Enzyme design. Structure first.
Site, short mmCIF file in Angstrom:
data_model
loop_
_atom_site.label_atom_id
_atom_site.label_comp_id
_atom_site.label_asym_id
_atom_site.label_seq_id
_atom_site.Cartn_x
_atom_site.Cartn_y
_atom_site.Cartn_z
N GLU A 1 82.01 7.25 -56.22
CA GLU A 1 81.11 7.89 -55.68
C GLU A 1 79.86 7.83 -55.90
O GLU A 1 78.89 7.90 -55.13
CB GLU A 1 81.42 9.40 -56.11
CG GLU A 1 82.82 10.02 -55.32
CD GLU A 1 82.98 9.51 -53.78
OE1 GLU A 1 84.05 8.94 -53.53
OE2 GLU A 1 81.99 9.68 -52.92
N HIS B 1 94.24 11.06 -38.52
CA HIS B 1 93.12 10.34 -37.87
C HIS B 1 93.25 10.32 -36.42
O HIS B 1 92.48 10.35 -35.59
CB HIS B 1 92.99 8.94 -38.38
CG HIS B 1 92.72 8.72 -39.91
ND1 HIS B 1 91.29 8.84 -40.60
CD2 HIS B 1 93.32 8.99 -40.98
CE1 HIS B 1 91.16 8.75 -41.72
NE2 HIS B 1 92.37 8.81 -42.12
#
Ligand SMILES: *[C@@H]1O[C@H](CO)[C@@H](O[C@@H]2O[C@H](CO)[C@@H](O)[C@H](O)[C@H]2NC(C)=O)[C@H](O)[C@H]1NC(C)=O
Lengths: 596, 270
Positions: free
Chosen positions: A357, A487
């Protein structure tokens, strides 16, 4: 006044109001994700509605300036980004229907449950009732029940909607002057180099097929090794020269073979490299985790984290009574505001997640100088690739040895390298065929090669050929097995992971060559290397201001996507697999099925 | 001939310059409407500033920051406004960009320095302080010390937007977007009697001797003698046919003194 002059004025006014609305929308989103409440969700929606209306209105005006008359690439790229989208073409009835189809598909996936045969009242939702079964269960029939039940309740319900979804999505793409919805998705990699022909979407398809042909040998050997291990795990259900059943892949869809590591472990006696106990013993907390991540990033020459990052970020779960979204996310709110919203805990997984991150915040603290529209990774993959390269550099046993998290007495022998490389392949190599095959099926469905009358047949033929996986039970055109994935049901592209893996390993090899690292490519740390950090920062600073092909040429020396670094990374694993597959069979037959 | 003494002269000024009323004002104006305050007839004590580590930028061109307390100027102009953190850079001679094209400018021969410091705690709110404006576009770049205070509207594409735009100062913004208060001092060269000088005390005059003289900033070495030259009220220095300063007017006694080299002819040391 040249068209360029008017374009510059329009773009300047656009960046002014765009930074204003985006930051406010990002502030509303941060308040809601950090404080769950109907009031907060109301604000977020209002901020997002304002931003979307402004973006659509500005995108409509941006088409007044032809990209041809534009000379400066920067202005031309900003105008291309604005003109590509920001104006739907579907009629009001069709737009409302599309919205309803999408919302319904999300609702069915979220509320989807599979109820047991004997007890209809006992039911298991995907999270975590069903996922736990696929992840941990080793009972062939229990996994078959979970797999077939998820398909029956979810795919069949999304089957009529997904068909309509394709018809509407393709129509919207055609209105954007594209061939189909898959062609519209591939527009990310399309570039216009000034030195000659650039990159095209058909070139993206050619590259992904060629890269799959190059990965096939390593994937074939990994498939054979996993097939032998599954024969040890599930007898009387696996054919030595055939495909692997879909429900025995450690997952609902078998995207990652990570959960099969306990069964496929090369050397069970040698343990993993977990340092959670050492992190807890030394009194580590989230603050120390992010400070050590900052020390790693500052060693290569990247800038320190801003004080606002430390004063405005949610590095722990609040305990005052505030509900939060626990999924890790690096935030770029705008106006120089970079934060991370993550439930940091004292574990190695959270350590690497913090580095990943923070790798996102380090790419964002560079392209920040770029205009707002070009404040993005060169392509869908470059960004995630940057984060993964950081995670690879920090996860090496040598780097943990410096931090004191790994005991100096630890010895890196061949067996530990084989275990680590097999785990990396299960999470990386075992995913590339699945991602490539799923995206190829979606592209062929959108284009029209596969009519609805043959959706399940081709899906199972393509799965058997490309992925070497066979359906446990026969499936008729009433099923929509692809839509059983998040997805596919939630309208997201999937080739980004494929390109992310390729670009990540290319960056890793390039920076390891710059860092003067001699030895295996999987034991490389770019720490304390100002040259590697300098070339990385040059790569991160351009953002989307230049073709990703040039960026790739600047960092790795080649302008073409290459799986060569990936194969060199897994070269010891490939040699060990070839040694273990002499007596076994390499390859699979697309004729054998478990139900015949 | 080494100087045996130092002669320093300043005009009889007792009032202290009102720098505090500018650097500590309660409200600062926007860049497009920057406020100029004229400073004259006072003693400039720059220790109130340099000593403070509050200033993020203090760059003087044409003068030395350490020698500010030793100089004299006819007039000093104090300009104050608020800009962004990443934009303080455009406050410099020869620099182009949004500040230095449509809402402020410093000439290539600018003499003086700008002082900038972070004012988030005063000009940045949690919900956003939108009381500061900036002008994205004006028809032509602005002469250097021109002010555009008109509220007019400009055309982008087919939409009529306003030339002035809200800065958007938030407390959670990065230092590049945080508010900065910028104060500059413009120094006017000596064309009239000096009105702004340092806090140094005038020294006794020494004539007919090789001494170091400092008349209102004019530093040099020479022999001071009585001069028959008559200077005008606005004249402070006299120059010979070779454009060399040969006569200087005393700021304290209002008399003219001739400046001569301490030695005549070639000198050889054995
Ligand atoms: C950015 O959005 C904010 C939304 O609040 C705008 O803020 C307002 O600006 C107007 C301009 O006259 C003021 O009258 C309001 O009082 C402001 N709102 C508040 C709550 O103070 C701001 O104008 C926008 N900025 C830009 C660049 O357009």
């Amino acid at each position: 006044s040249t068209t360029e002059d008017e374009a510059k004025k329009f773009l300047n006014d656009f960046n002014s109001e765009a930074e204003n609305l985006t930051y406010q929308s990002s502030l509303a989103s941060w308040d809601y994700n950090t404080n769950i409440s109907d009031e907060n969700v109301q604000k977020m929606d209002e901020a997002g509605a304002k931003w979307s209306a402004f973006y659509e209105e500005q995108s409509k005006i941006a088409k007044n300036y032809p990209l041809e008359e534009i000379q400066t690439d920067i202005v031309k790229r900003q105008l291309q980004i604005l003109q590509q989208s920001g104006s739907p073409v579907l009629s009001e009835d069709k737009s409302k229907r599309l919205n309803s189809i999408l919302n319904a598909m999300s609702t069915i996936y979220s509320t989807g449950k599979v109820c047991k045969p004997n007890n209809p009242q006992e039911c298991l939702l995907l999270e975590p009732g069903l996922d736990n079964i696929m992840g941990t269960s080793k009972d062939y029939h229990e996994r078959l029940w979970a797999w077939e039940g998820w398909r029956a309740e979810v795919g069949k319900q999304l089957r009529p909607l997904y068909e309509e979804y394709v018809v509407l999505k393709n129509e919207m793409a055609r209105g954007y002057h594209y061939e189909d919805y898959g062609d519209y998705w591939r527009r990310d990699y399309e570039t216009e180099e000034s030195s000659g022909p650039g990159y095209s979407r058909d070139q993206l398809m050619k590259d992904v097929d060629r890269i799959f042909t190059e990965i096939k040998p390593l994937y074939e050997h990994l498939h054979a090794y996993v097939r032998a291990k599954l024969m040890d795990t599930y007898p009387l259900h696996i054919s030595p020269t055939g495909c692997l059943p879909a429900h025995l892949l450690g997952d609902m869809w078998g995207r990652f073979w990570t959960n099969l590591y306990p069964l496929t472990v090369p050397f069970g006696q040698k343990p993993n490299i977990d340092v959670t106990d050492e992190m807890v013993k030394q009194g580590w907390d989230a603050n120390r985790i992010f400070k050590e991540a900052e020390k790693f990033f500052v060693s290569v020459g990247l800038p320190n984290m801003t004080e606002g990052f430390w004063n405005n970020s949610m590095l722990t779960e609040p305990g005052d009574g505030r509900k939060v979204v626990c999924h890790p996310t690096a935030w770029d709110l705008g106006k120089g505001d970079f934060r991370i919203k993550m439930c940091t805990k004292v574990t190695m997984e959270d350590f690497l997640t913090a580095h990943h991150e923070m790798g996102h915040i380090q790419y964002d603290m560079a392209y920040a100088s770029q205009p707002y529209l070009l404040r993005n990774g060169a392509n869908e993959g470059f960004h995630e690739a940057v984060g993964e390269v950081m995670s690879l550099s920090v996860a090496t046993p040598k780097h943990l040895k410096t931090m004191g998290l790994l005991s100096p007495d630890f010895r890196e022998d061949d067996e530990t390298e084989i275990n680590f490389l097999l785990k990396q392949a299960l999470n990386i190599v075992g995913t590339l065929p699945f991602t490539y095959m799923l995206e190829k099926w979606r592209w062929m469905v959108f284009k029209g090669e596969i009519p609805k009358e043959e959706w399940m047949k081709k899906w199972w033929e393509m799965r058997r050929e490309i992925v070497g996986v066979v359906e446990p039970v026969p499936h008729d055109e009433t099923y929509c097995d692809p839509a059983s994935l998040f997805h596919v049901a939630n309208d997201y592209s999937f080739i980004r992971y494929y390109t992310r893996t390729i670009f990540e390993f290319q960056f890793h090899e390039a920076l390891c060559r710059i860092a003067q690292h001699n030895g295996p490519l999987h034991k490389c740390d770019i720490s304390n290397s100002t040259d590697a950090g300098k070339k990385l920062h040059q790569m991160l600073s351009v953002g989307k201001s230049q073709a990703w092909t040039k960026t790739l040429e600047d960092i790795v020396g080649s302008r073409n996507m290459d799986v060569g670094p990936l194969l060199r990374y897994f070269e010891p694993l490939y040699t060990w697999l070839q040694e273990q597959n002499r007596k076994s069979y390499v390859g699979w037959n697309t004729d054998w099925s478990p139900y015949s | 001939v080494q100087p045996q003494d130092t002669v320093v002269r300043f005009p009889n000024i007792t009032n202290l310059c009102p720098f505090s009323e500018v650097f500590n004002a309660t409200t600062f104006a926007s860049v497009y409407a920057w406020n100029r305050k004229r400073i004259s007839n006072c003693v400039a004590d720059y220790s109130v500033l340099y000593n403070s580590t509050s200033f993020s930028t203090f760059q003087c061109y044409g003068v030395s920051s350490t020698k500010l307390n030793d100089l004299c100027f006819t007039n000093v102009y104090a300009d104050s406004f608020v800009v962004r953190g990443d934009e303080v850079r455009q406050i410099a001679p020869g620099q182009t960009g949004v500040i230095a094209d449509y809402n402020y400018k410093l000439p290539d021969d600018f003499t003086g320095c700008v002082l900038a410091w972070n004012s988030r705690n005063q000009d940045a709110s949690t919900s956003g302080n939108f009381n500061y404006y900036y002008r994205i576009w004006r028809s032509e770049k602005l002469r250097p010390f021109e002010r555009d205070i008109a509220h007019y509207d400009y055309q982008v594409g087919t939409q009529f937007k306003s030339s002035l735009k809200n800065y958007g100062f938030y407390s959670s913004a990065g230092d590049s977007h945080q508010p900065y208060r910028v104060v500059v001092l413009s120094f006017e060269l000596l064309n009239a009697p000096a009105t702004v000088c340092g806090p140094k005390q005038s020294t006794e005059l020494i004539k007919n001797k090789c001494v170091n003289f400092n008349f209102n900033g004019l530093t040099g070495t020479g022999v001071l003698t009585d001069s028959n030259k008559k200077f005008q009220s606005f004249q402070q220095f006299g120059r010979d046919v070779s454009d060399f300063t040969d006569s200087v007017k005393d700021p304290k006694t209002l008399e003219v003194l001739d400046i001569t080299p301490c030695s005549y002819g070639g000198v050889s040391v054995i």
